Amino acid sequence: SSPLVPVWNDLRALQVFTSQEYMQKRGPGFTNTLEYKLSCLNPVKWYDMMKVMPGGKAFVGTALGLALFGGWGVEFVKNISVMTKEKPPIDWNNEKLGHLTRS
Amino acid sequence: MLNSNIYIIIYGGIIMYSIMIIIQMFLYNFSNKIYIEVEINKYILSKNNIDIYWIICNCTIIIIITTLNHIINKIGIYNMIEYNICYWLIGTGLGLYISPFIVFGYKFFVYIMDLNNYSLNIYHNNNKMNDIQQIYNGTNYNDTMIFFIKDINNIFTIYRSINFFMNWLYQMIYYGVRMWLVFVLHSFSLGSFGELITVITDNNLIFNVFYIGLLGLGFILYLIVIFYLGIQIYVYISFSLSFLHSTILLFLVNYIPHYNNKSIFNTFTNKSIY
Amino acid sequence: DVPIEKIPEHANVLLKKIDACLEILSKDIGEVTDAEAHEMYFETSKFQILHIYTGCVASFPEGDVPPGAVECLPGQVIRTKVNGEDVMLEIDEVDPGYQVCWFKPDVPLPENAEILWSYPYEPTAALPTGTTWEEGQANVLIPAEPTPEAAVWPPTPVT
Amino acid sequence: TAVVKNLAKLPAATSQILTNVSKLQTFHGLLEERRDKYAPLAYHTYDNLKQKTTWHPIAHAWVDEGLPVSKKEYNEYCWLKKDMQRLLPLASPFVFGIYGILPLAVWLSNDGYLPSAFSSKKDIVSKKLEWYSSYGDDLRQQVGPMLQHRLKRHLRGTLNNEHRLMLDEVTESYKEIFYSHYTGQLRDVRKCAHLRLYDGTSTVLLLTNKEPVELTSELLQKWNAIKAAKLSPEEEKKARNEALIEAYKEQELHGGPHVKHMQGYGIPADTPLLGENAKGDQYTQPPESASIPLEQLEWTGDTVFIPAEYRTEMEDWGRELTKLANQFLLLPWRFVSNAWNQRRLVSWFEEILQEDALIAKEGGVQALSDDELKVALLDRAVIRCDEELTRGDMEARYKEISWLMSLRNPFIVLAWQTGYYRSTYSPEDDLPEASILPKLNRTVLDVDVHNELAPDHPEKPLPRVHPALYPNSHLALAKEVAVLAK
Amino acid sequence: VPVANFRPKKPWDGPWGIQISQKKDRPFIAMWILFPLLLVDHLTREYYAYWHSSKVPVTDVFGDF
Amino acid sequence: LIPVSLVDLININIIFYILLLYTLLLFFIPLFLASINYTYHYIYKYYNYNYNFINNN
Amino acid sequence: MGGKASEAVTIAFRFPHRTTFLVKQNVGQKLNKGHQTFWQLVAGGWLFFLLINRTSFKPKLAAPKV
Amino acid sequence: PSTSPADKDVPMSILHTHGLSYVNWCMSLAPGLLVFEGFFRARYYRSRVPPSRTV
Numbered sequence A: 001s002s003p004l005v006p007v008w009n010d011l012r013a014l015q016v017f018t019s020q021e022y023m024q025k026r027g028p029g030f031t032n033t034l035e036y037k038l039s040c041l042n043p044v045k046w047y048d049m050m051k052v053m054p055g056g057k058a059f060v061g062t063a064l065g066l067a068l069f070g071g072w073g074v075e076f077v078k079n080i081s082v083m084t085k086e087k088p089p090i091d092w093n094n095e096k097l098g099h100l101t102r103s
Numbered sequence B: 001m002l003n004s005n006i007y008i009i010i011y012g013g014i015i016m017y018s019i020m021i022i023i024q025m026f027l028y029n030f031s032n033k034i035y036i037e038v039e040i041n042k043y044i045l046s047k048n049n050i051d052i053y054w055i056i057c058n059c060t061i062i063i064i065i066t067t068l069n070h071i072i073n074k075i076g077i078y079n080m081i082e083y084n085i086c087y088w089l090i091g092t093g094l095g096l097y098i099s100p101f102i103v104f105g106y107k108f109f110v111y112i113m114d115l116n117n118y119s120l121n122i123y124h125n126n127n128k129m130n131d132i133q134q135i136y137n138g139t140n141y142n143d144t145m146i147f148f149i150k151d152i153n154n155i156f157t158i159y160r161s162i163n164f165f166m167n168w169l170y171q172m173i174y175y176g177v178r179m180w181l182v183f184v185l186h187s188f189s190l191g192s193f194g195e196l197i198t199v200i201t202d203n204n205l206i207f208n209v210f211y212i213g214l215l216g217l218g219f220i221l222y223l224i225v226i227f228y229l230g231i232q233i234y235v236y237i238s239f240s241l242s243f244l245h246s247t248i249l250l251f252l253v254n255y256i257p258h259y260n261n262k263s264i265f266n267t268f269t270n271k272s273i274y
Numbered sequence C: 001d002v003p004i005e006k007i008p009e010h011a012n013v014l015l016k017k018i019d020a021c022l023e024i025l026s027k028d029i030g031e032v033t034d035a036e037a038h039e040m041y042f043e044t045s046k047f048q049i050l051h052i053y054t055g056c057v058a059s060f061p062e063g064d065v066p067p068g069a070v071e072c073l074p075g076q077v078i079r080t081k082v083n084g085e086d087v088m089l090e091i092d093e094v095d096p097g098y099q100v101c102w103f104k105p106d107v108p109l110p111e112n113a114e115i116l117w118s119y120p121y122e123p124t125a126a127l128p129t130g131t132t133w134e135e136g137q138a139n140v141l142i143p144a145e146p147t148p149e150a151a152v153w154p155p156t157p158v159t
Numbered sequence D: 001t002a003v004v005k006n007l008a009k010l011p012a013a014t015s016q017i018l019t020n021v022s023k024l025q026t027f028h029g030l031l032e033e034r035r036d037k038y039a040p041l042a043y044h045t046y047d048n049l050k051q052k053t054t055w056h057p058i059a060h061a062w063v064d065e066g067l068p069v070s071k072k073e074y075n076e077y078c079w080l081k082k083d084m085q086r087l088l089p090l091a092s093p094f095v096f097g098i099y100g101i102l103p104l105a106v107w108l109s110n111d112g113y114l115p116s117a118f119s120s121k122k123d124i125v126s127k128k129l130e131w132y133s134s135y136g137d138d139l140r141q142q143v144g145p146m147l148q149h150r151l152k153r154h155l156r157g158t159l160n161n162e163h164r165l166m167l168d169e170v171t172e173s174y175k176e177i178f179y180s181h182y183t184g185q186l187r188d189v190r191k192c193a194h195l196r197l198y199d200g201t202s203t204v205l206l207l208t209n210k211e212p213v214e215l216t217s218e219l220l221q222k223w224n225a226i227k228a229a230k231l232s233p234e235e236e237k238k239a240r241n242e243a244l245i246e247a248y249k250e251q252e253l254h255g256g257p258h259v260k261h262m263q264g265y266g267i268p269a270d271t272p273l274l275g276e277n278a279k280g281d282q283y284t285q286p287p288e289s290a291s292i293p294l295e296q297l298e299w300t301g302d303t304v305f306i307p308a309e310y311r312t313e314m315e316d317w318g319r320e321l322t323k324l325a326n327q328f329l330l331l332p333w334r335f336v337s338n339a340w341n342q343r344r345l346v347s348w349f350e351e352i353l354q355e356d357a358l359i360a361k362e363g364g365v366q367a368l369s370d371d372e373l374k375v376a377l378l379d380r381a382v383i384r385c386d387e388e389l390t391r392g393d394m395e396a397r398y399k400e401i402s403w404l405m406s407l408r409n410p411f412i413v414l415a416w417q418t419g420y421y422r423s424t425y426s427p428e429d430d431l432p433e434a435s436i437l438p439k440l441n442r443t444v445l446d447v448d449v450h451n452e453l454a455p456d457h458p459e460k461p462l463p464r465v466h467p468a469l470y471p472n473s474h475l476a477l478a479k480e481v482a483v484l485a486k
Numbered sequence E: 001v002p003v004a005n006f007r008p009k010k011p012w013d014g015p016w017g018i019q020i021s022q023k024k025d026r027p028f029i030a031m032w033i034l035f036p037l038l039l040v041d042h043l044t045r046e047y048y049a050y051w052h053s054s055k056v057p058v059t060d061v062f063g064d065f
Numbered sequence F: 001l002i003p004v005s006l007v008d009l010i011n012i013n014i015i016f017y018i019l020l021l022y023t024l025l026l027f028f029i030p031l032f033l034a035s036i037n038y039t040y041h042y043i044y045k046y047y048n049y050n051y052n053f054i055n056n057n
Numbered sequence G: 001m002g003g004k005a006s007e008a009v010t011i012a013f014r015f016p017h018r019t020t021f022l023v024k025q026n027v028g029q030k031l032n033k034g035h036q037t038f039w040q041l042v043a044g045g046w047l048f049f050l051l052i053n054r055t056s057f058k059p060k061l062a063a064p065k066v
Numbered sequence H: 001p002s003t004s005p006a007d008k009d010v011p012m013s014i015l016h017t018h019g020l021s022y023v024n025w026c027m028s029l030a031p032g033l034l035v036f037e038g039f040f041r042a043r044y045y046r047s048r049v050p051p052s053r054t055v
């Protein structure tokens, strides 16, 4: 591994403990805000807090994220080296071939 | 016809050459058993030790057997089999690669699927906000508007979970390729020097004689070959297991100290209170 | 339904049984002596086996070997007949400043030689007689094999 | 064959099957009605890896002390539950098709695969004994030794690592429990309880409005005394909270509960204040309950059992040992996680405990018949049908395993049980010879449960002292004496 | 009365020890038959292609051709 | 060089070799496990329960 | 290439918590359960959902009308 | 279908063999077997000594 690992660890600790410091500073009353009341109705929050649950819910969350969006992510990664490349015009189907009377 | 999709496979001498590799295992009788016992007990302590041990033993003895069949029993496949890359990557390396995942696959899978929920690991985590962040938001880190890129995040997080299982694959491939290169290049170089010597002596028949001796040169080359290839096989096995330790088995270090029991002949129960 | 006086009868029965067991188990099989089992110990010697039935074997000081004498170095195996007994003699630790050789009758012995053992002249004989090691000619040592004390189990005392 | 013999009664069996289902429904209605108002909530807990549930009898096996039910009726309940389990192959045609009848034929072939309705007998005890002697003892006699080996090799470990895993004080007890089929001597159950030394100390934290307090023999004695005094709740709660604050002070002087300094468990300290939130020297932020005065310490009614089974816990057993433990107990084991087999084993445990309670209500073991006691021991898996023991030996066996199951540990229970299923076969016809001594007889008095036994030191085992030789034994054994002489 | 922890053998007790020995020495017996067969398979072999070969031996496995 | 080839990287012939080899391994496992250790002989011979009796007098 | 186990935390650091069995006194919370006719309506809705999404195979559409 | 062409059937004779060199023959490892067969046989059958009488 690289020698920059402790640097990244320090920065990670920075962001984590600063978010925790903010959460301590603002104190109670977070449940009365609109952010919490909207997150209660937000499926992203449901998924994110179900991921860490026990009973295989980590596997469920990972596999669900994969099946839904990770396939599009694989396609996106495949398409990074396709956007810059010269491609021909799309031979749009003339929708003439295939029709045949029944008998 | 259109529906006929034809494939050509290649086939050669496989059956009778693979049968004797297994029949020899009764003669060797796992002579490598003590070495792998020592090394496995050096590198890990668990109930599932014997499992991984058996795996390695089988793998290792097969390698050893093939090597001797490659050195002595020279017929058909036994000559090529150590000069082929498919044998060194799939016939030796893949089994050793998948052995810990087949023995400790439950724990590794649970670990991997938990690491997709990426979070900062705190030692002596007596913090309270850490728990709320891990449950409510899912991670210690700020996950705000990362769903916006979830399509990549998922797959990237998947690699983030297996990145510390990847150097094992790299070392397996590297040492398979190393053994292949070693065998091939040394055989080729030795044969090339021999052929050059034969060209020097065939054009000068005063030297086209058994000048070193019928057995002297042969005995010396036998010793050289066996010493070198035994050193290389020992290197392969020992380094493969040391890297197995340093790459896959340090995850499973769970030392439990012994705590003395006191309430042996009496146990508190739900009926003691309720 | 079992009085206490009937116990030592049962103990005597079981003592008879275990004694009948131990008188058999006290026996053990010794080392095998069949030559057909150990012929390869001699086949694999560092020197070929000398089938000696004629001439003499003599010890003489080290140096030039008489031409015609067959050297008998340490590790040499010799098939002979000694007092009617077909035997293999393996040379072990010939003394320093000395060497041993088989001298057929055609070969003259050197000076300062000591005939360790000799054979008779029996050319017409089909089954040779071999040698006769007299008392003082050869010191044969039988292993002592001192039978150690029979392992006794400690009896516990009863007051 | 038996296939046509069972097809002959298959029409006569459906009526009995439905009648038995109705009986099961009624009994379960009664039992659940009692359980839903007298029993606590045993919460679900996941294993250390947090993927599958884990189960222990201390929390999940509840005993309804006061169940107005006859012992035979509970036997019927459990046996009919097992019959419902055995009725499962009837679903094969309804998932595979009309060709899913060959499994039904295989089901009807062996009578041991079948429920009670296919049996000619009438009494539940005779039916159970028939099933056991025909199929179940044989099925159990081929799992016992292998289960014993798995338990051994779970303790001592694999690959020659006994010096790192085994204890030198449980050594002689281990030998007496697992290698007494070599000596032929009887075993003391306390030597199987010594196997719990591999584990840690089992604790019970009562949760209060301030802090958790560790339960002790003194606090439990005081609570039992208050419960027996039958005081008003204004006095009952007051005395309970007095004992609770006393125990809180006692443990605070001890150095906190045992759980604070045990690997895998722990009580968090006061939370930290991060960065500028730190007010000078006060680097901590105590909880809300710190505001509550200690005199208001009240029990929340919530409890936390911590067995501290570091080597005995059923999670670390494995995919194979759990299956064999369920096989040996004649429970379902195939194609399920170890959590489900854990629940099945704990349910069997609960059934046996409830049956023990009902037996004690019905007047102990001596009130039972010979066949009924035989069947009880078969359910406990301490007897095989090829023994023909005496009544006293059976009673002692029941007492032994009943005390052992009172401790709520399946491992030692299985270690005890498997010792009664180590039978050999001789290669000769004359040997084993006909014995000269009488059959083995014992009594309830010969079993020492009322006394503690220290673990014998390694390679220094001590002889067995009868309970009668202890001082004042005639006073301690007076209950058993009154039960036996009568 | 008989001695305890003893019984007659049953089908699920497996085979006797002599039978297990007879199972063990079957590979050792087939060794003597298979090593000569290995040498014969190598020695009585012919290559399948040459510089002049217009055809190569084909083996239709399932007779589809 | 001949062994330097992508055709020999995923050679189906060597895969058949590996397949037959490890199927035969699986077939012969119960004969590899048929080695006897003399540890339970030791346990039977040396495990000696305390045979002394109790005597209050 | 790739990381190692020496460069990462163990399977014991993650998942460090052993098991503790919680129990709670019965005040009467699981009594007087309402909605006795809930599962009947749920099964009815399930069968309705299956019926509206049902489609019988009609091979008569392939009849040689021509 | 399956085939067995005549191209594989060709003449054979040991007279047409190029052969081997002294070096290639030494590399065939026959001279090693020649020694080590006897070495291992000797070690095995000489490890097990029989009883004797010292003269």
Ligand SMILES: CCCCCCCCCCCCO[C@@H]1O[C@H](CO)[C@@H](O[C@H]2O[C@H](CO)[C@@H](O)[C@H](O)[C@H]2O)[C@H](O)[C@H]1O
Binding pocket: B070, B071, B186, B187, B188, B190, B191, B224, B225, B227, B228, B229, H023, H024, H025, H027, H028, H029
């Ligand atoms: C400790 C020693 C350190 C110095 C190391 C020196 C390198 C030694 C390399 C030993 C490995 C060479 O491996 C060996 O190669 C030779 C030469 O092709 C092969 O030899 C084979 O092919 C050659 C090629 O012409 C034929 O001529 C020969 O008859 C045949 O035996 C052996 O079958 C193989 O075992």
